[PDB]
Amino acid sequence: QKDLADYPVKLKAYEDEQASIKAALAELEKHKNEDGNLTEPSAQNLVYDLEPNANLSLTTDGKFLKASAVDDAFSKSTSKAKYVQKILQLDDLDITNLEQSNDVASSMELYGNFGDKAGWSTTVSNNSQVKWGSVLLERGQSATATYTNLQNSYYNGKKISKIVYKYTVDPKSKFQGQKVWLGIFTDPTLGVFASAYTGQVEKNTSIFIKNEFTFYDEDGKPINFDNALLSVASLNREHNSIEMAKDYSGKFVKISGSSIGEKNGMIYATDTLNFKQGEGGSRWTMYKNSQAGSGWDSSDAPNSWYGAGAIKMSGPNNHVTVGATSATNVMPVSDMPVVPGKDNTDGKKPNIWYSLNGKIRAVNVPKVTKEKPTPPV
Ligand code: NA
DSSP states (O other): OHHHHHHHHHHHHHHHHHHHHHHHHHHHHTTSSSSSSSSOOOOBBOHHHHHHHHEEEESSSSSEEEEHHHHHHHSGGGGGGHTTEEEEEEGGGGGGGOOOOOEEEESEEEEESSSSSSOOTTTTTTTOOOOEEEEOOOTTTTEEEEEOOOOEEEEEEEEEEEEEEEEETTOOOOOOOOOOOEEEEEGGGGGGEEEEOSSSSSOOOEEEEEEEEEEEEEEOBBBBEEEEEEEEEOOOOOOOEEEEEESEEEEEEEEOOOEEEEETTTTEESSSSSTTTTTOOOOOOOOOOOSTTTTOOOSSSSSSGGGEEEEEEEESOOEEEEEEEGGGGSOGGGGSSOOOOOOOTBBBBBBEEEOSSOOOOSSSSBBBBOOHHHOOO
């Protein structure tokens, strides 16, 4: 029991941080209504934002797609142009070329910018290497992803060894067609890419994916969260499209000054668009350009909180539905923001890229890193 010799420094590191966090919250209490601050000051006991080397395993009641089939689909149709430039434009992939019988594989196969495409870039993280498994699902069908051997994730300083996510295609999705391509990245924090895009934009459509997740400790036991913060970011809203989260467990917490809020049980840019500065009330342009504050929509943007919020969750099993839907499916045209020269009725691609991790976008959120050491017996 050399524990009694190490316990002294362990308890101090804990108590130090613990006290350091308490003081930080009391300090944030007067800045909670300032831009980028969580309206409800709170610490993040869930460290979950970096897992580039995690292992991925999938099962599905749908169909696995051969990696070669995914590669061919990328080289054809609407993604062809970008393909020739050595770019994997996921939001342009025509799902049509993944619906043939000869595309189905018996097991999971990874694809991405790494094989003979190590140099290539993708729309998920430019040149950084990225890998994903692919399935073809119909409404109600799903894929269950098991992420193992993580190395940077912790809950209350307790190491997270495994995460099991179940992705289900919401039957109420209105996209035309019966199929959806799901690309699940090996790095659980990158999330997934869901698409029913068959080459043409669609009106009054949507694509919603239900997300059920359980995090496990080093003993393989589900982790019973106690107000952990889940990041709901990149909730884009253009004049004709709204990305939102709904049907979720836990409580929504707003980030002061963010365009994201909660209305009628849905989390999205409730009162303005957030695509282009000056358009539809948007404060900043989502993509990087000449104007200050632009490019807010990235994981590292200092003002990414503009299109983000958070959910305080507890319990061993949690869930949230994320998707993109035509603005018309959410409210009457006469109640929408007006952008001269743009038709709020325009169809959109029924696809989406999203993730659910612990990288809360609010500013100065104190992190819990030290676990409370238990007195040796
Ligand atoms: Na987004």
